[PDB]
């Protein structure tokens, strides 16, 4: 009984090496759910191999929703 988090599908176009828990692993074809975009333009979001929730630098990953209206 609690609200869902809602966030953007993207894609990991290269994998990443986090060196903190803090950062969350990314790997080249994998599915990312952005929550949060950071100013300087790093991602904040979770998963979908580790259903982990961290920063990665979104230059690895791409919006793969496509174009939409904002």
């Given amino acids: ?3 869902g988090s ?5 894609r990991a176009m290269y994998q990443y090496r986090p ?4 950062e969350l692993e990314l790997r080249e074809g994998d599915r990312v ?3 949060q975009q950071c100013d300087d333009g790093w ?8 259903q982990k ?3 990665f630098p979104g ?5 793969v929703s496509g174009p939409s209206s904002g």
Wanted: hydrophobic fraction near 25%; aromatic fraction near 12%.
């Fill in 59 to 63: 230059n690895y990953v791409a919006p």
């Fill in 43 to 50: 991602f904040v979001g979770v998963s979908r191999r580790t």
């Fill in 33 to 35: 759910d952005v929550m």
């Fill in 19 to 22: 060196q903190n828990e803090d």
């Fill in 53 to 55: 929730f961290g920063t």
């Fill in 1 to 3: 009984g609690s609200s």
């Fill in 6 to 10: 809602s966030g953007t599908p993207y």
